[PDB]
Amino acid sequence: ARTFILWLHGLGDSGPANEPIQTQFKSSELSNASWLFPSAPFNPVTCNNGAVMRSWFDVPEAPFKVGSPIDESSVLEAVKNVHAIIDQEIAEGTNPENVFICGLSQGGALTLASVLLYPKTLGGGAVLSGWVPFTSSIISQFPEEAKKTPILWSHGTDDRMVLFEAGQAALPFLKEAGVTCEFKAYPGLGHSISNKELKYIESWIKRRLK
């Protein structure tokens, strides 16, 4: 049926600059999927000394480690924007289980926050080199259906922008929240997208579609 894939770009990037990602998804099963690459608003970014750029939410510190500070309210503002996109596409007849949210880096952190806060079960969330953008205080607000959405987390072991330990820290967080997560480590990969990483995400989406 109709598949919808929302891709969330990283810090300072844009939607149109990442639309060629869909050319790497060459399978026949995803060929009819509808992709959307939105662009974040221009916001000041604290880890860049308040410089304005396309940013989903404020990043207080980078490189991101376990225990690096976060701006939780700023993330929830971005979640509202993502949820309006999902709300609209569901209100146009897409089955929520056919909706997939994927994101790189800051867009990965937004993918995680948007999926765990959406009132309905979605097809899945694919996090590429993301981080947990809020504290455990938010776990109590995760809707019941949202905890059934499968999460695929991909992270590079050599990443020094978002430390690999920060991606590892997402697993105890997600287990405490009652969320299923497949963690896929990529040896020698840094803070970037590899083609084998994307192919594994395509295969993962295909199996979720069953």
XYZ file of C-alpha atoms in Angstrom:
210
model
C 0.000 0.000 0.000
C 0.949 3.664 0.345
C 4.224 4.053 2.251
C 5.317 7.416 3.657
C 8.937 8.115 4.621
C 9.811 11.321 6.472
C 13.528 12.169 6.462
C 14.897 14.696 8.964
C 18.216 16.335 8.077
C 21.039 17.176 10.470
C 22.300 20.461 11.856
C 22.686 23.266 9.319
C 21.606 21.024 6.423
C 18.330 21.227 4.486
C 15.602 19.012 3.080
C 16.394 19.402 -0.632
C 20.097 18.728 0.007
C 19.191 15.264 1.345
C 16.468 14.268 -1.158
C 19.085 12.316 -3.210
C 19.139 9.850 -0.284
C 16.077 8.223 -1.857
C 18.098 7.259 -4.950
C 20.009 4.795 -2.753
C 16.725 3.023 -1.918
C 16.564 1.205 -5.249
C 14.339 -1.734 -4.302
C 11.055 -2.446 -6.060
C 9.207 -2.653 -2.732
C 10.038 0.940 -1.731
C 9.786 2.382 -5.249
C 6.199 3.550 -4.674
C 6.964 5.132 -1.290
C 6.234 8.830 -0.816
C 9.231 10.729 0.568
C 9.149 14.089 2.323
C 12.293 16.080 3.164
C 11.260 19.096 5.268
C 13.693 21.842 6.232
C 14.215 23.050 9.781
C 13.634 26.726 10.601
C 16.567 29.091 10.930
C 17.296 29.153 14.671
C 20.209 30.286 16.833
C 22.420 27.361 17.852
C 24.103 27.555 21.250
C 27.026 25.221 20.531
C 27.833 27.524 17.581
C 27.795 30.663 19.769
C 24.247 31.571 18.791
C 24.919 31.505 15.053
C 21.681 31.180 13.095
C 21.303 28.159 10.821
C 18.781 25.494 9.927
C 18.332 23.683 13.234
C 15.485 21.486 14.454
C 16.182 22.395 18.082
C 18.877 24.071 20.132
C 22.043 22.058 20.797
C 23.782 23.340 23.969
C 27.001 21.352 23.513
C 28.886 19.496 20.772
C 30.629 16.986 20.564
C 27.776 15.200 22.335
C 28.751 12.834 25.159
C 26.807 10.877 27.726
C 25.679 13.612 30.089
C 26.013 16.449 27.584
C 23.328 19.081 28.272
C 20.116 19.207 26.252
C 17.282 21.691 25.703
C 14.152 19.615 26.265
C 11.583 22.348 25.574
C 13.270 23.199 22.269
C 12.993 19.543 21.207
C 9.280 19.430 22.037
C 8.717 22.453 19.785
C 10.296 20.546 16.893
C 8.237 17.460 17.777
C 5.053 19.492 17.275
C 6.208 20.361 13.755
C 6.984 16.724 12.930
C 3.671 15.553 14.398
C 1.760 18.030 12.218
C 3.318 16.388 9.151
C 2.401 12.905 10.380
C -1.075 14.105 11.406
C -1.663 15.525 7.925
C -0.512 12.420 6.046
C -2.607 10.192 8.310
C -5.574 12.541 7.837
C -5.074 11.959 4.092
C -5.540 8.205 4.467
C -2.077 6.761 5.052
C -2.103 3.889 7.513
C 0.074 4.931 10.490
C 1.815 1.545 10.306
C 2.968 2.583 6.805
C 4.696 5.730 8.143
C 8.454 5.719 8.728
C 10.548 8.472 10.310
C 14.278 8.585 9.615
C 16.883 11.152 10.553
C 20.611 11.799 10.615
C 22.348 13.304 13.666
C 20.091 16.113 14.987
C 17.356 14.761 12.726
C 17.973 11.371 14.307
C 17.411 12.756 17.800
C 14.255 14.417 16.471
C 13.108 11.136 14.899
C 13.398 9.416 18.281
C 11.537 12.185 20.117
C 8.818 12.451 17.464
C 8.143 8.708 17.316
C 8.055 8.077 21.069
C 5.608 10.982 21.523
C 3.211 10.221 18.665
C -0.179 8.958 19.915
C -0.295 6.099 17.382
C 1.934 3.186 16.451
C 3.988 4.016 13.364
C 5.850 1.801 10.926
C 9.210 2.579 12.465
C 11.857 5.097 13.423
C 15.340 4.919 11.891
C 17.922 6.866 13.908
C 21.246 7.520 12.160
C 23.956 8.739 14.561
C 21.448 10.429 16.864
C 21.235 10.955 20.598
C 18.582 10.962 23.315
C 17.381 14.604 23.270
C 15.556 14.554 26.627
C 15.791 13.130 30.137
C 13.926 10.199 31.685
C 11.400 12.739 33.027
C 9.651 12.540 29.635
C 9.197 8.746 29.632
C 5.900 8.955 31.537
C 4.458 10.959 28.622
C 5.160 8.331 25.938
C 1.752 7.246 24.560
C 0.810 3.582 24.804
C 0.813 2.932 21.048
C 4.069 4.864 20.553
C 5.975 2.238 22.563
C 5.066 -0.381 19.940
C 6.838 1.476 17.120
C 10.063 -0.371 16.212
C 13.258 1.680 16.369
C 16.375 0.996 14.306
C 19.433 2.819 15.656
C 22.551 2.990 13.478
C 25.736 4.493 14.894
C 29.377 4.627 13.855
C 31.871 3.300 16.381
C 34.465 5.960 15.438
C 31.987 8.867 15.692
C 33.536 11.802 17.573
C 30.715 14.284 16.845
C 28.014 12.236 18.582
C 29.981 9.748 20.652
C 29.176 6.081 20.132
C 28.607 5.763 23.892
C 25.797 8.323 23.584
C 24.060 6.062 21.075
C 24.691 3.086 23.355
C 23.097 5.035 26.217
C 19.846 5.087 24.226
C 19.333 1.350 24.788
C 18.941 1.388 28.615
C 16.784 4.502 28.193
C 14.556 2.746 25.647
C 14.381 -0.469 27.687
C 13.250 1.557 30.711
C 10.579 3.124 28.488
C 9.423 -0.269 27.204
C 10.514 0.326 23.596
C 11.963 -2.269 21.233
C 15.184 -1.098 19.595
C 17.596 -2.811 17.217
C 21.049 -1.264 17.610
C 23.366 -1.624 14.605
C 26.978 -0.574 15.114
C 29.166 0.358 12.142
C 32.894 -0.184 12.779
C 35.191 2.581 11.588
C 32.275 4.807 10.565
C 32.265 8.377 11.841
C 29.537 11.013 11.867
C 28.295 10.307 8.355
C 26.041 8.048 6.295
C 27.512 4.987 4.599
C 25.798 3.206 1.726
C 25.777 -0.116 3.585
C 24.053 1.707 6.454
C 21.277 2.903 4.133
C 20.912 -0.531 2.529
C 20.388 -2.060 5.973
C 17.705 0.562 6.660
C 15.968 -0.254 3.369
C 16.026 -3.971 4.210
C 14.730 -3.120 7.686
C 11.820 -1.071 6.311
C 10.971 -3.843 3.836
C 10.745 -6.461 6.596
C 8.607 -4.149 8.738
C 6.246 -3.809 5.774
C 6.374 -7.642 5.697
